[PDB]
Design a protein around this ligand. Structure first.
Ligand SMILES: O=C1N=Cc2cc(OC[C@@H]3CNCC[C@H]3c3ccc(F)cc3)ccc21
Lengths: 631, 339, 59
């Protein structure tokens, strides 16, 4: 049940819609996936001034991703010759004095980090921003961009947009399902929290926090955290669309495997560290680091899951005793004691220990009393086995230092200090990030049943639903990537061959002339005005907004009807059969209802109609011939 | 001071003018014409109903052929109508929506229009391949275009809400002459049949007589209590009629240099939008804000006839050069031909 | 508008308007009436013209 792009006529509305937010600049569209994709298609095929500039941009972007210094030495000399020296030899160089000098110096010294061409990138973007951006905007690639952007801004997800499959998680508040987004065919995890359970247990702030948290984190493409693409809700279910991880969690596998070796745990630790790093860059403390909240994908790689008890410390620090017992740091547990990233390093130490010994450091002899578990944390050094390596020791020693002054990962440079640990001498952290290291445990064939933890007389009211008002969301980066990686190519292709047939049909028909050009038209595009409501009569017409009137027309004809700006008394937003419409009130007490095809269209038609009618009326008021007088 | 002296001298000069005008008021037009036979009730019916405009019609103008006529509407178009058959000759999408005035060239080759664009746009009708297109956009006025009339195919005169009128050289687009003097928005003008002279009516409630060639004002006629919305010359060009928001039309003689007659009634409170004389000048036709056009005995000031059809304001009217018919344009988006 | 130039321009205009030759209203009116009587036979709205002449009634 695919994506259908709107007609090219959508541009008139969208271009203004984006124009109003300053979202039509090179900067903004170039740093979007689909935008970039279209911008290069323009430059690389439908232009020759820009073709080389973008090729050069790209070959560099590829050079950044080269996995070795050996590869870089080679490709650098290639890129320099091909793109820099050839043009320079001829004399027609389009770049600054310093920029070229910066690079060539580092080349005569065979020291080639993946950044030497950074000064060129900025000056490529100088050459592309403006003069060439203009030509792109004026091209129908920007139109194509306006078509996708319309689909992006008109997303309202529901369960029916998902092909939902088996259950892969069970939490106190909800469940997780494997699902496919029919739309593009993307595999996702759907997390369904029952609102009735949330009310019951008073975990609303928690459910709301996770969403707010997920959104701070789900950008940047992080391999080691479960990230969000969409959130939405039904009347009684909060739904999160998340990274798929259908290989159970560590708390489970740990119970099936038994304790892990130093080398096996090393793998998990590395990946978790990096995922911590990501959150700590975005100023978020996870505060619930545990084997139960670390999941495995089909291949055996890990991600940090469930950000319910995480927190943003960007603005102000937290000081509350929150998290799982056995893994909370001294500074956290102590109430009236502020903290930051600090805690999770301590928590890390606690969990990694569990991986090796099967129980929390501060949980020996299976004692349940959680008050004295906390006592072992504040003023007590941890005792470690006779079979731990000296490097494992000094890691865990540093990780579990009661003092934050003398704790590993809390001295300034953060996660680096931990990566620098001699426990990880053998690791290449770039190669960890690329997920190249083989996982120690690969999940099985028959479904895992491996993400479990350890009554109703309840209604839902006005005030309950209003909590979940800002809940729904869509991460643009995520949706664009998903699209870019599935259908973007094949849809543009199908759309192109469709638009080109309608144009080649209209050449023979003779319909191909735009009524809007050469006049003072503000905006145009399709809407549907209501005829007889009892007949479900809705009439799609093409509208033209002029400074003093609103015309419209049918199939293969001029505009036969219109509505003056003088007539319009109000422009109101209204609802009919769960559809948002515009309600124009007319001088004779007459009503005019219009359905738009998308939110941005409704938003823009409302603004521009309101703008026109108020301005026209103020204007006519000052014109003796036109103004109304005493009759 | 010098400035006080010229304020004084202008006041004494204004009296000397009034006195000189009183000195000629030996009789009235009504006394003079008191003898002649009244015209009888004029019984015009609607022959043609010109349907096509989608909004308020703001202005119209007849061709000199007494057949083709151009019209300007709120629907941002001009239509040139064949009045005989009601066929549209041309429909012209304008580059601005805020049109107020239109005009037809004597030859019938060009037409003009304008409005809140502040521009007189000239349109050649007989282009080299059957089309129509803007030949020239006369720009210079710092206010809206209130009215415009061709002298010939190479010259045209415009009035404007910047309180001035102007003569343009169409070939070069230049502003040949400017007619400064009015203290309020100029609303209408009418060319003398000789076309060495024209008059203008304005929101300062005065009319003015201008010499085209000399480019100055000769005479200033006041009297109306409110804004003058329309103006037309008597067929011999020795007198002219005005129509105002004050619910009266008035007749001014140039040589006597004063008002001769007032055309009004207590059952008319609403303002006059347009005026035109019948071919002999005996009838004065006026379009009103009460949807009727009234036909007036220009000599006896009795109301003779009443053109009632339109459902909204009659914004404009015009009599043919052969004097056979009266076109009336309206806010109801229709033109009607009366006869 | 304390413009001395502007004042001068008004005065001198009011001379141009003042110093003209005017005729008596009775002479003016008589000439108008004499016109309307002269051209009354050439005004279809004033006098009955047959359908044959009138290009509107029966076409
Ligand atoms: O594919 C997935 N993507 C996220 C995810 C999460 C997941 O469970 C996360 C929690 C891990 N620890 C035990 C409880 C699990 C859970 C938590 C909340 C919930 F609603 C459902 C399950 C299982 C599978 C996936």
């Amino acid at each position: 049940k695919k994506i259908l792009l709107p007609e090219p006529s959508i541009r008139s509305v969208m271009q203004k819609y984006l124009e109003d937010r300053g979202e039509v600049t090179f900067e903004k569209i170039f740093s979007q996936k689909l935008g970039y994709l279209l911008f290069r298609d323009f430059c690389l095929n439908h232009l020759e001034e820009a073709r080389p500039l973008v090729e050069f941009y790209e070959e560099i972007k590829k050079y950044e991703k080269l996995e070795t210094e050996e590869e870089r030495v080679a490709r650098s000399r290639e890129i320099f010759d091909s793109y820099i020296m050839k043009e320079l030899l001829a004399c027609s160089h389009p770049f600054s004095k310093s920029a070229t000098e910066h690079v060539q110096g580092h080349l005569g010294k065979k020291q080639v980090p993946p950044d030497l061409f950074q000064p060129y990138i900025e000056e490529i973007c100088q050459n592309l921003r403006g003069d060439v951006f203009q030509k792109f905007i004026e091209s129908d690639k920007f139109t194509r961009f306006c078509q996708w952007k319309n689909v992006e801004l008109n997303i309202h997800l529901t369960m029916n947009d998902f092909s939902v499959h088996r259950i892969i998680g069970r939490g106190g508040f909800g469940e997780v399902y494997g699902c496919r987004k029919a739309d593009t065919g993307k595999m996702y995890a759907m997390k369904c929290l029952d609102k009735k359970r949330i009310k019951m247990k008073q975990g609303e702030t928690l459910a709301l926090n996770e969403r707010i948290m997920l959104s701070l984190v789900s950008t940047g493409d992080c391999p080691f955290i479960v990230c969000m693409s969409y959130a939405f809700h039904t009347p009684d279910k909060l739904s999160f669309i998340l990274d798929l991880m259908n290989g159970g969690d560590l708390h489970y596998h740990l119970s099936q495997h038994g304790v892990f070796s130093e080398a096996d745990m090393r793998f998990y630790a590395a990946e978790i560290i990096l995922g911590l790093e990501h959150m700590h860059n975005r100023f978020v403390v996870y505060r619930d680091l545990k084997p139960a909240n670390i999941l495995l994908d089909e291949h055996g790689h890990v991600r940090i899951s469930d950000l319910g008890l995480a927190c943003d410390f960007s603005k102000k620090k937290p000081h509350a005793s929150v998290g799982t017992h056995g893994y909370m740091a001294p500074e956290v547990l102590q109430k009236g004691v502020a903290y930051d990233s600090s805690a999770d390093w301590f928590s890390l130490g606690c969990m990694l220990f569990k991986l090796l010994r099967g129980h929390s450091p501060f949980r020996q002899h299976k004692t349940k009393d959680k008050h004295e578990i906390d006592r072992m944390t504040l003023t007590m050094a941890v005792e470690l086995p006779d079979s731990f390596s000296p490097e494992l020791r000094s890691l865990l020693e540093g990780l579990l230092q009661r003092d934050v002054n003398r704790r590993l990962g809390c001295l300034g440079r953060g996660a680096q200090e931990v990566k620098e640990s001699p426990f990880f001498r053998s690791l290449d952290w770039q190669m960890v990030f690329l997920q190249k290291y083989p996982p120690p445990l690969i999940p099985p064939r028959g479904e895992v049943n491996a993400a479990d933890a350890f009554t109703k007389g309840i209604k839902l009211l006005d005030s309950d639903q209003e909590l979940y008002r800002n809940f729904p969301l869509t991460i643009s980066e995520r949706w664009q990537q998903e699209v870019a990686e599935t259908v973007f190519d094949t849809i543009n292709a199908e759309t192109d061959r469709l638009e080109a047939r309608k144009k080649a049909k209209n050449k023979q028909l003779g319909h191909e002339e735009d009524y809007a050009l050469g006049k003072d038209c503000i905006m145009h595009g399709y809407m549907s005005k209501m005829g007889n409501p009892f007949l479900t009569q809705w009439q799609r017409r093409y509208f033209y907004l002029f400074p003093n009137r609103l015309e419209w027309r049918g199939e293969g004809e001029a505009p036969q009807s219109l509505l003056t700006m003088e007539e319009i008394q109000s422009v109101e937003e209204t609802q009919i059969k769960e559809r948002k419409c515009l309600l124009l009130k007319i001088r004779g007490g007459k009503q005019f209802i219009l359905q738009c095809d998308s939110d941005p269209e409704l938003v823009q038609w409302k603004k521009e109609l309101r703008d026109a009618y108020r301005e026209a009326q103020q204007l006519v008021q000052r014109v003796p011939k036109m103004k109304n007088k005493p009759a | 001071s010098e400035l006080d002296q010229l304020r004084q001298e202008a006041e004494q000069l204004k009296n000397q003018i009034r006195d000189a005008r009183k000195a000629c008021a030996d009789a009235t037009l009504s006394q003079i014409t008191n003898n002649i036979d009244p015209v009888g009730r004029i019984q015009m019916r609607t022959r043609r109903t010109l349907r096509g405009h989608l909004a308020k019609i703001y202005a119209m103008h007849w061709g000199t052929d007494s057949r083709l006529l151009v019209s300007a509407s709120q629907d941002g178009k001009l239509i040139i109508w064949d009045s005989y058959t009601t066929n549209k000759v041309h429909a012209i999408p304008l580059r601005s929506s805020w049109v107020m005035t239109c005009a037809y060239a004597p030859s019938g080759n060009y037409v003009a229009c304008g409005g809140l664009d502040n521009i007189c746009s000239i349109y050649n009708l007989k282009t080299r391949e059957g089309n129509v297109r803007v030949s020239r956009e006369l720009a210079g006025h710092t206010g809206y275009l209130s009215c415009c009339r061709f002298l010939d195919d190479n010259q045209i005169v415009t009035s404007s809400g910047d309180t001035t009128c102007a003569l343009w050289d169409i070939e070069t687009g230049q502003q040949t002459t400017t007619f400064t003097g009015h203290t309020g928005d100029v609303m209408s003008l009418s060319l003398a049949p000789d076309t060495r002279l024209f008059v203008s009516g304005a929101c300062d409630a005065s009319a003015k007589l201008w010499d085209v060639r000399e480019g100055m004002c000769r005479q200033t006629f006041t009297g109306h209590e409110s804004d003058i919305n329309a103006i037309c010359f008597f067929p011999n060009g020795n007198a002219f009629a005005t129509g105002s928001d004050d619910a009266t039309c008035r007749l001014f003689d140039l040589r006597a240099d004063q008002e001769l007659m007032t055309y009004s009634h207590d059952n008319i409170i609403c303002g006059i939008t347009s005026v035109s004389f019948s071919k002999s000048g005996r009838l004065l036709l006026a379009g009103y804000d009460d949807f009727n056009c009234n036909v007036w005995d220009a000599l006896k000031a009795d109301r003779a006839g009443v053109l009632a059809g339109h459902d909204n304001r009659v914004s404009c009217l015009g009599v043919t050069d052969d004097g056979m018919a009266v076109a009336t344009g309206s806010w109801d988006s229709f033109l009607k031909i009366w006869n | 508008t304390a413009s001395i130039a502007q004042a001068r321009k008004l005065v001198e205009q009011l001379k141009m308007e003042a110093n003209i030759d005017r005729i008596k209203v009775s002479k003016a009116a008589a000439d108008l009436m004499a016109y309307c009587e002269a051209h009354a036979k050439e005004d279809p709205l004033l006098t009955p013209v047959p359908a044959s002449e009138n290009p509107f009634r029966e076409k």
